Amino acid sequence: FLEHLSGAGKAIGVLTSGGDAQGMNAAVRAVVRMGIYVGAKVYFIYEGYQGMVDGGSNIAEADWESVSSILQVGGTIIGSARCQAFRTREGRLKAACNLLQRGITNLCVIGGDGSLTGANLFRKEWSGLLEELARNGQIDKEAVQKYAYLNVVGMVGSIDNDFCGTDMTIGTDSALHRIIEVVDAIMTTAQSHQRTFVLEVMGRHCGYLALVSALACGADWVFLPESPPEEGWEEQMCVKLSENRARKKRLNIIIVAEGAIDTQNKPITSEKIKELVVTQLGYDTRVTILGHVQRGGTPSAFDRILASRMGVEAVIALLEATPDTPACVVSLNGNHAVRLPLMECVQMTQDVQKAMDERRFQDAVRLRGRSFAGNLNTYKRLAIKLPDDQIPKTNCNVAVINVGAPAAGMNAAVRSAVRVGIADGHRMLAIYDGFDGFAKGQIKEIGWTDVGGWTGQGGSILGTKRVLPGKYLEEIATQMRTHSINALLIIGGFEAYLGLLELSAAREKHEEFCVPMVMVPATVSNNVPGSDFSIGADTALNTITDTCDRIKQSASGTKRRVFIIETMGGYCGYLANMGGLAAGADAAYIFEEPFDIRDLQSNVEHLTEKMKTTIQRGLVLRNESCSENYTTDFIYQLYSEEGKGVFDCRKNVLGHMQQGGAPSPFDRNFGTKISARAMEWITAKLKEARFTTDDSICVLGISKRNVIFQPVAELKKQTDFEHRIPKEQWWLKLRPLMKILAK
Amino acid sequence: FLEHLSGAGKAIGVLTSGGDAQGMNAAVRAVVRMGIYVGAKVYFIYEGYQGMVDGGSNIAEADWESVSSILQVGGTIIGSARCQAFRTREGRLKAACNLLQRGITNLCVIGGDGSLTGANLFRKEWSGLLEELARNGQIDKEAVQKYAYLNVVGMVGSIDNDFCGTDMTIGTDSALHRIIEVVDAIMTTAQSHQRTFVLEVMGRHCGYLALVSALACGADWVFLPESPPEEGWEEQMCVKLSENRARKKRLNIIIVAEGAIDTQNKPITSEKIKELVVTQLGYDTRVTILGHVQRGGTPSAFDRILASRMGVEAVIALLEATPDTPACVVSLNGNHAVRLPLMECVQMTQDVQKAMDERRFQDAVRLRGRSFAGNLNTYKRLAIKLPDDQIPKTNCNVAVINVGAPAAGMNAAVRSAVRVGIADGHRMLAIYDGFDGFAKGQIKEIGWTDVGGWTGQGGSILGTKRVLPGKYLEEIATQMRTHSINALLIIGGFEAYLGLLELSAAREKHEEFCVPMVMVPATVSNNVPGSDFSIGADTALNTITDTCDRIKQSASGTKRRVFIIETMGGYCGYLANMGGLAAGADAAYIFEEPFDIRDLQSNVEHLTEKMKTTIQRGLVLRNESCSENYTTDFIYQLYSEEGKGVFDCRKNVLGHMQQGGAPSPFDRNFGTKISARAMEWITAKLKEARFTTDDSICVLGISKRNVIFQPVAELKKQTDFEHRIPKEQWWLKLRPLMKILAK
Amino acid sequence: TMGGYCGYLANMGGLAAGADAAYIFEEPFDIRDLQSNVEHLTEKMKTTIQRGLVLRNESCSENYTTDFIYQLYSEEGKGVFDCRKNVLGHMQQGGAPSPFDRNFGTKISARAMEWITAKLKEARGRKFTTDDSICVLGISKRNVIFQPVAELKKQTDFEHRIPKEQWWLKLRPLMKILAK
């Protein structure tokens, strides 16, 4: 719809300066391919800023073929480097001069707190740098007026995330993986020798990756620069570890921020701890500093997407910016990408440092992010069980259950749901084998020490069947009428929706279902209406994006070959699309977007023109059931006879391997995060009677920027029951974008 | 066949004491399930040796259901711990006593250098320990004669591999993964900031994982305790790094052994190096000590197989041992598992430390393994290019090529082949696009700096097509001359085999094919006759064994479900079998082992009796084409209608996702290792003219314990050309075993 | 219809039953010849004849199979016409022989028995090593003739097992113009 508006003729320079984080390539890829799409010239700037000063070999134009085959790699191919000869006007001039020699009037910088502030100045000094170049007569006197205005745009890029202008900065999810990967491995070595480990994650300033990772591996204790330990923590920690040996947890994991501190700026080294536990508890302890393995590695799905979206929203922001409009720093807020003023953002970032240095920790917290406070609170109120007798019991029965297909990171949702329940004063009942078990009586009260160590496990434990209750609506109520069940917590997918939607029926027929029930999105499909995201979704999506890279391997080894992969996920083309954009597929056929033999024919042509360039590979993803006639076989059958002579092609039907492996850190948190707020909505609405109106049975889920409880009742509207997909689907806005990155 | 004479009545005790290495669980799983198959009782011994002293809660019987769902986990579920109260007779007695109380007469210890020596004494003191127990009257006076003989067996288990009784110890391949995983990640952060890293791998005594890993990531320099650096290495290293910057290698990786030393016992810390390079080169440098992430993580395929095979060969050795027979320590030598004397094994291990302490490094090397010397030699002679002018050119043209399907770890074979060639005095010619390009003239001379950094990349670069050299023999002859080629190396699967054979009898014909030619196994199928292994085999097998665990996830979440996965690999059921044993499949239908509707029927029954126990999952692998009638659909169609009411079931057809991803560390080495010895066979046989016979065209591959060059001629015998698989296939001996383990 | 790669059965049967199109191997075709035929089938679904018949040679294309052909025609009609698929089994080569075969079998088989009786009398008062010592009798122009299996190696596609030059392909344009 906005493809028309495209500033052409002009050029843009792209560079990378700062903590080389994963997904950085996927960014410069969206920038180059988009910059060309709009009809402008895109130049490369090696060694970040240093490349500008130097020039010549550090500046070259980039073709569509250039940024190809780099999306699936960490670090940055453009190269990064700290340039000091730029922080000085005496040399910042050489940079400017070199730009006019190439005709670049716009620039896109992908760095960090400082790197951005660099261009913020260059932007201003420009009018002053051209005055000197024209004066000394080093550049054509004409140029002094053609390239008078200088537009720049910054981009969030560093695993630190010490930036409050955006919730997530390109790299976080990637580095977060690297951290969890190391831990999940270490946990097997500690669960044997029954010892305790102390880890040191990155983040000299922001203690973000230090908290999210911890919540992701159900850590025992965390040390953050923003929220230091209350005086007297030394004995309070040993209290925990002392109880963890008494509860039989032969494993203890300690997460420490690179810049840990206590009530006073006094640093909290990881050794100062190793000493504390072994010299006061006697437990064998080993501390390890996670190497730069946090900035390297393969970019996760989330990172590639965010990167590829930012790279575009940045290109448009460059030619859609006025000579007097503030410097913009594209960033993902809530769910939709939005540009923000650079200066104002660096301010917030610096302010966090200000508060911390002035023992104002309490304020420095609500300054890093309005989700950060909620995360710390969620973690702690879930990693500490105040004595059994100090918890005011409510004498109510709340039950949890897993209805639907198993989704990675589901056990994580149960761990939270249970603990946030017991710690709230309720007795927990676990319904095994989904509904199938519910009716059979497979119910058992579980405890706190029970759901311990699940945040890391995938698949399901309490079982889970897509078994609809619509016909066993009796055997169920009959069970609740013999367990004191006064609450319910479903965790699944669309199957669960129909579950509550049906339950509400037998209320004027069965006085037992007349209780509070809250469903939480838990499916790899993400077809759950009333939420833009689902638990275990980002996991499979990560498994898919990965597998596509390994398939793009055999497609490159053997020149001129195309692959057709059939991703699963009912009619919901979520998985199919997000994965196609994350692996850079030439096309992804989802159901939600109709297509005839022509949309297909007109795409085989584009695939042929690619078998001329360097990229002699081909990748096309197809939604499990996007069409009843054009099947995985059909698509392949056509592509073969229509290519015959130009390229080869095969087909693969991704099995359930997707929804299987260990849950992605994003699910390890999502599962734990939005499930607690689901448990309080219960405690809060269960206290109201301390239930009729069709609403006490809703579905908590991500909507705008934050989650909200929507009564399953009013969700009947925006939902396609025939294809089992929500009517309005947000990720369709990426459709035009996703494709312009094809050709 | 040999499962005839088994054994009952008596009982066996299993424990784990030492460096908890991955795949340890997969070991105790084979011991338990086998000890039961033989008809004996198997007891658990928690906390390694400490459990023996204690007793009671640290000793329990294990059912078939017990050791289930642990195979795919690192560390040890039995628990490990160092017990000092055992190194003393005063307490070693409490251990013995507790054993008679449970009726255990045999024992299997899975530990290390020290842990094993422990039972070696216990074995002897036994007669003396029962003398005191009967005297003091603590055990029934009768028992003093029923349990008079005490049989024990040790098992290689520790990632150190500081054991020369066996080539590989349960854990190596797994810890080697963890190491390579960390590196491959760090290399992206270093290839950006163009810096140098110094890594510190495990191995306080043996510098194994330090050499193998290095060779796997094409490291720049290594430090080993057995082969220290020649006096004057300080400047020699800087010489390298200085040239790597001159050759444009914006990345330098240094691998240091945990116990590195120089000509003298003087330790070589990783810092002592960080100082050296930065204070003498000025390059930015960061050193990181790979935490215990090397002992943790998920066990690799190689590890699980070796583990599962050792656990069995151990059980049989226990009941097949006489009262006066030396203590045995099962270990994999060459390719077939063979038991060896404990004491005699510990001697060798202790002797390596002896030599090192007496500056006898030269002997200490040929004492750790007859392959070690060949590996160190391979690495070094491939990481240092003596000046262009100091290399006595031979003025000969040797060309390499990739014929067949792309196999992970193929580029690695080219890197080696190329360098070992230039460093031998030959000019290297690279044939792109396999044969299809060979006839097209897609030939180009490559250099040393060209094939730099390939050992880590998967897929292929020189392209690779399954096209035979037949129909275009003339378009290959004419070209052959244009470059005046004399030697041709091949990196392909069965495809390449047919290549060499077609070129053999096609000599008298085209007089251009009369020269030395050597092929090397490079296919994920492993159907290449004349070799027990293939390049890229262990990779796909690792991806398969992984994917199966992710499927075994969704099969456990939804109780009572069976999956049918169709692995690929022509008729060669290699992939299908090894993967089935590595993931614990209930059955794997390969072609090499015929079966009727009865073997199938009699297996669905076994699957039903499992749906009664705790394990309500089901996994069955089927070879791509093991039967023309019983296809993946058929197998599923039967299993469904035959279970209907007891269990559900689905089917998945693994795509080319197998042979795709980054090559496994075992392939990264195999490719480089046995590829050089293939290049020397050329340099050695081309200097013989200082060429039309059956001994000029051969297939270099693994046979007995070591590789050997077998003329493609005499290989026509042991090869099934109709099904493209070697007649005699070694891994078929594991068939009975594989099945008794799964039941 | 079956019949290896030889589209004879498929063609003659399609012309005899008035099939809208018969896809044989001997006559290549892309997704366009297929597309441009679904259109003609739609314009017929306007007249009186609301039927559609398309024959496909057992293996005229490795990609475009009976299911493919049907899978396309279904989605490409959706709203104008329905469609199903049938794979004629060996029922074809089975029933009692047609009177033309009852004769052909007996007719040209006798003249094949005499060619033997006559070439037994040749070198009687006079061994066989020539090329015309093992020929194949078959209808060529107007009448049959004995062609030595030797010189038949030329006009024969061994890969698909069909003679190179096939006469009945002259009926291709005709066969189709009769299908509208």
Ligand SMILES: Nc1ncnc2c1ncn2[C@@H]1O[C@H](COP(=O)(O)OP(=O)(O)O)[C@@H](O)[C@H]1O
């Ligand atoms: N105040 C400044 N003025 C101008 N350029 C700056 C300034 N601060 C940083 N830079 C530029 O950006 C580069 C990166 O600085 P750094 O603080 O390391 O970035 P980041 O915050 O991403 O880690 C410097 O080498 C310089 O080129």
Ligand SMILES: Nc1ncnc2c1ncn2[C@@H]1O[C@H](COP(=O)(O)OP(=O)(O)O)[C@@H](O)[C@H]1O
């Ligand atoms: N002579 C001995 N007698 C009894 N136990 C011993 C003896 N030597 C070693 N052990 C046992 O093995 C432990 C030593 O660790 P070890 O097994 O050598 O580790 P690793 O598996 O890494 O080689 C001791 O704590 C003890 O439990």
